[PDB]
Write an enzyme that holds these catalytic residues in place. Structure first.
Site, PDB file in Angstrom:
ATOM      1  N   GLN B  26       0.800  -1.216   0.000  1.00  0.00           N
ATOM      2  CA  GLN B  26       0.000   0.000   0.000  1.00  0.00           C
ATOM      3  C   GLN B  26       0.834   1.268   0.000  1.00  0.00           C
ATOM      4  O   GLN B  26       2.001   1.290   0.397  1.00  0.00           O
ATOM      5  CB  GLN B  26      -0.871   0.022   1.283  1.00  0.00           C
ATOM      6  N   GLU B  92      -4.329   3.494   0.024  1.00  0.00           N
ATOM      7  CA  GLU B  92      -5.021   3.679   1.295  1.00  0.00           C
ATOM      8  C   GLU B  92      -5.310   5.160   1.509  1.00  0.00           C
ATOM      9  O   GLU B  92      -4.393   5.988   1.547  1.00  0.00           O
ATOM     10  CB  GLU B  92      -4.178   3.131   2.464  1.00  0.00           C
ATOM     11  N   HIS B 119       4.545  11.474  -6.297  1.00  0.00           N
ATOM     12  CA  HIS B 119       3.321  11.063  -6.984  1.00  0.00           C
ATOM     13  C   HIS B 119       3.135   9.546  -6.959  1.00  0.00           C
ATOM     14  O   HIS B 119       4.027   8.793  -6.576  1.00  0.00           O
ATOM     15  CB  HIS B 119       3.396  11.450  -8.472  1.00  0.00           C
ATOM     16  N   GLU B 165       0.689  10.372 -12.079  1.00  0.00           N
ATOM     17  CA  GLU B 165       1.324  10.312 -13.407  1.00  0.00           C
ATOM     18  C   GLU B 165       0.576   9.303 -14.272  1.00  0.00           C
ATOM     19  O   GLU B 165       0.109   8.279 -13.766  1.00  0.00           O
ATOM     20  CB  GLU B 165       2.797   9.894 -13.290  1.00  0.00           C
TER      21      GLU B 165
HETATM   22  N1  LIG Z   1      13.583  17.706 -10.121  1.00  0.00           N
HETATM   23  C1  LIG Z   1      12.538  16.670 -10.229  1.00  0.00           C
HETATM   24  C2  LIG Z   1      13.184  15.328 -10.706  1.00  0.00           C
HETATM   25  C3  LIG Z   1      12.103  14.241 -11.059  1.00  0.00           C
HETATM   26  C4  LIG Z   1      11.328  14.497 -12.358  1.00  0.00           C
HETATM   27  O1  LIG Z   1      11.524  15.526 -13.015  1.00  0.00           O
HETATM   28  N2  LIG Z   1      10.453  13.580 -12.756  1.00  0.00           N
HETATM   29  C5  LIG Z   1       9.714  13.818 -14.020  1.00  0.00           C
HETATM   30  C6  LIG Z   1       8.770  12.629 -14.233  1.00  0.00           C
HETATM   31  S1  LIG Z   1       9.639  11.039 -14.505  1.00  0.00           S
HETATM   32  C7  LIG Z   1       8.590   9.815 -13.613  1.00  0.00           C
HETATM   33  O2  LIG Z   1       8.004  10.296 -12.642  1.00  0.00           O
HETATM   34  N3  LIG Z   1       8.375   8.561 -14.030  1.00  0.00           N
HETATM   35  O3  LIG Z   1       7.570   7.754 -13.410  1.00  0.00           O
HETATM   36  C8  LIG Z   1       9.166   8.100 -15.179  1.00  0.00           C
HETATM   37  C9  LIG Z   1      10.283   7.317 -14.880  1.00  0.00           C
HETATM   38  C10 LIG Z   1      11.083   6.875 -15.926  1.00  0.00           C
HETATM   39  C11 LIG Z   1      10.729   7.228 -17.212  1.00  0.00           C
HETATM   40  I1  LIG Z   1      12.011   6.508 -18.777  1.00  0.00           I
HETATM   41  C12 LIG Z   1       9.639   8.004 -17.539  1.00  0.00           C
HETATM   42  C13 LIG Z   1       8.829   8.456 -16.491  1.00  0.00           C
HETATM   43  C14 LIG Z   1       8.869  15.143 -14.078  1.00  0.00           C
HETATM   44  O4  LIG Z   1       8.263  15.533 -13.091  1.00  0.00           O
HETATM   45  N4  LIG Z   1       8.832  15.713 -15.291  1.00  0.00           N
HETATM   46  C15 LIG Z   1       8.004  16.942 -15.527  1.00  0.00           C
HETATM   47  C16 LIG Z   1       8.092  17.285 -17.030  1.00  0.00           C
HETATM   48  O5  LIG Z   1       8.588  16.428 -17.793  1.00  0.00           O
HETATM   49  O6  LIG Z   1       7.671  18.394 -17.404  1.00  0.00           O
HETATM   50  C17 LIG Z   1      11.764  16.461  -8.891  1.00  0.00           C
HETATM   51  O7  LIG Z   1      12.345  16.653  -7.797  1.00  0.00           O
HETATM   52  O8  LIG Z   1      10.566  16.101  -8.942  1.00  0.00           O
HETATM   53  N1  LIG Z   2      -4.853  10.479  12.514  1.00  0.00           N
HETATM   54  C1  LIG Z   2      -4.084   9.499  11.709  1.00  0.00           C
HETATM   55  C2  LIG Z   2      -5.127   8.499  11.115  1.00  0.00           C
HETATM   56  C3  LIG Z   2      -4.489   7.247  10.416  1.00  0.00           C
HETATM   57  C4  LIG Z   2      -3.802   6.251  11.358  1.00  0.00           C
HETATM   58  O1  LIG Z   2      -3.773   6.446  12.575  1.00  0.00           O
HETATM   59  N2  LIG Z   2      -3.247   5.157  10.823  1.00  0.00           N
HETATM   60  C5  LIG Z   2      -2.655   4.191  11.791  1.00  0.00           C
HETATM   61  C6  LIG Z   2      -2.077   3.037  10.973  1.00  0.00           C
HETATM   62  S1  LIG Z   2      -3.350   2.045  10.092  1.00  0.00           S
HETATM   63  C7  LIG Z   2      -2.586   1.670   8.464  1.00  0.00           C
HETATM   64  O2  LIG Z   2      -1.791   2.517   8.099  1.00  0.00           O
HETATM   65  N3  LIG Z   2      -2.771   0.537   7.785  1.00  0.00           N
HETATM   66  O3  LIG Z   2      -2.116   0.313   6.702  1.00  0.00           O
HETATM   67  C8  LIG Z   2      -3.793  -0.391   8.299  1.00  0.00           C
HETATM   68  C9  LIG Z   2      -5.047  -0.357   7.704  1.00  0.00           C
HETATM   69  C10 LIG Z   2      -6.065  -1.204   8.170  1.00  0.00           C
HETATM   70  C11 LIG Z   2      -5.779  -2.007   9.230  1.00  0.00           C
HETATM   71  I1  LIG Z   2      -7.293  -3.331   9.996  1.00  0.00           I
HETATM   72  C12 LIG Z   2      -4.541  -2.058   9.861  1.00  0.00           C
HETATM   73  C13 LIG Z   2      -3.518  -1.232   9.389  1.00  0.00           C
HETATM   74  C14 LIG Z   2      -1.506   4.793  12.699  1.00  0.00           C
HETATM   75  O4  LIG Z   2      -0.674   5.596  12.248  1.00  0.00           O
HETATM   76  N4  LIG Z   2      -1.447   4.230  13.913  1.00  0.00           N
HETATM   77  C15 LIG Z   2      -0.343   4.539  14.872  1.00  0.00           C
HETATM   78  C16 LIG Z   2      -0.560   3.710  16.155  1.00  0.00           C
HETATM   79  O5  LIG Z   2      -1.354   2.751  16.088  1.00  0.00           O
HETATM   80  O6  LIG Z   2       0.057   4.051  17.189  1.00  0.00           O
HETATM   81  C17 LIG Z   2      -3.237  10.158  10.579  1.00  0.00           C
HETATM   82  O7  LIG Z   2      -3.581  11.260  10.085  1.00  0.00           O
HETATM   83  O8  LIG Z   2      -2.211   9.565  10.165  1.00  0.00           O
HETATM   84 ZN   LIG Z   3      -1.386   2.102   6.048  1.00  0.00          ZN
HETATM   85 ZN   LIG Z   4       7.278   8.621 -11.532  1.00  0.00          ZN
END
Ligand SMILES: N[C@@H](CCC(=O)N[C@@H](CS[C@@H](O)N(O)c1ccc(I)cc1)C(=O)NCC(=O)O)C(=O)O
Ligand SMILES: N[C@@H](CCC(=O)N[C@@H](CS[C@@H](O)N(O)c1ccc(I)cc1)C(=O)NCC(=O)O)C(=O)O
Ligand SMILES: [Zn+2]
Ligand SMILES: [Zn+2]
EC number: 4.4.1.5
Lengths: 176, 176
Positions: B26, B92, B119, B165
């Protein structure tokens, strides 16, 4: 209160046929130092580096990590990119060149103001043995399995401070 | 410059056998209003709501969305939770109760200071036809396919401003 089940279902539409082959391919996080991040995701979490991309003009690199077998990565460059970018559930780490030597820079994990993104989560067979190994490796914990509010789940942090949940799907039924 | 391929590979370790069944389950995002988010992720993007969780004591709800067939969701409660939390690549959405009526609240998408998360990305068969349908539906674009630096990929925004994306894995090979 929150939405009732009925109201929630009332906001959902059936999937349009033109979205039938869509897949949730990646989650992108920016990382200050890729040497630390690569060691963490491969050595600690067991992910595989499936693709590295460099963009010299824009000064950044991308590292795709996933739970995939190394032997399935195609050898040909064009096939490799098409395969890597069509795997489900990949992690894309963005390295903006120069951040690793800049003392005034760091990324924000989304869990303190201003909030947004919370975490990625890894499903494991057994949270307790997985966290015992993490403790042996010196991994930093946000929440040990028995600490906090929800027992049986843990949060560790990666080298930039992003939170990673460790959860066992077969032990979640008593939390609700 | 960035890491060379060789240096990057030098930072990677083989996967320890105790991580062999781990899976990237997740990505968690906080959403201000779940009614808007559910409509966006199901109607616009074609995802399915596979599990809704409510925690009245902690005042929050969780909505798990995924590209899964509705007919595969188990009917029994305990089986449903185990199945939902063992699917790969789920989204989630966390709703903290009350945010939808609070005018001074909003979440941060990670793409303006302070940055971190970037993202989620959806792989589709054809970016241009998917974006044409998004335009017809009134979706807000961060980057249309032919705008920006990397041509052929797009970024849309969800109701909270998170960037999504839209990419075609079979058309990415000429970008590098
Ligand atoms: N300075 C940036 C560096 C990261 C970055 O620039 N990522 C790209 C998408 S690639 C990406 O996120 N992705 O999943 C991906 C990975 C590998 C490939 I091959 C193609 C895509 C972006 O945001 N481009 C905007 C644009 O092109 O205008 C930052 O911190 O986000
Ligand atoms: N007020 C919180 C609400 C969300 C939250 O509290 N999430 C739980 C993990 S459950 C979660 O992230 N997850 O994947 C999950 C989902 C469903 C189940 I069933 C069990 C786990 C957390 O951080 N607990 C800390 C603790 O227990 O001390 C927030 O903004 O992060
Ligand atoms: Zn979680
Ligand atoms: Zn990406």
């Amino acid at each position: 209160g929150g939405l009732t089940d009925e109201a929630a279902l009332s906001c959902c539409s059936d999937a349009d046929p033109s979205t039938k082959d869509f897949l949730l391919q990646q989650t992108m996080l920016r990382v200050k130092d890729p040497k630390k991040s690569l060691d963490f995701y491969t050595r600690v979490l067991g992910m595989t580096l499936i693709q590295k991309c460099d963009f010299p003009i824009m000064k950044f690199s991308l590292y795709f990590l996933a739970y995939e077998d190394k032997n399935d990565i195609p050898k040909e460059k064009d096939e490799k990119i098409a395969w890597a970018l069509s795997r489900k559930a990949t992690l894309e780490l963005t390295h903006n060149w120069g951040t690793e030597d800049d003392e005034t820079q760091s990324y924000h994990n989304g869990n303190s103001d201003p909030r947004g993104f919370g975490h990625i989560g890894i499903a494991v067979p057994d949270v307790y043995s997985a966290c015992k190994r993490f403790e042996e490796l010196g991994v930093k914990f946000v929440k040990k399995p028995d600490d906090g509010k929800m027992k049986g789940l843990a949060f560790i942090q990666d080298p930039d401070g992003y939170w990673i949940e460790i959860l066992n799907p077969n032990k979640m039924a008593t939390l609700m």
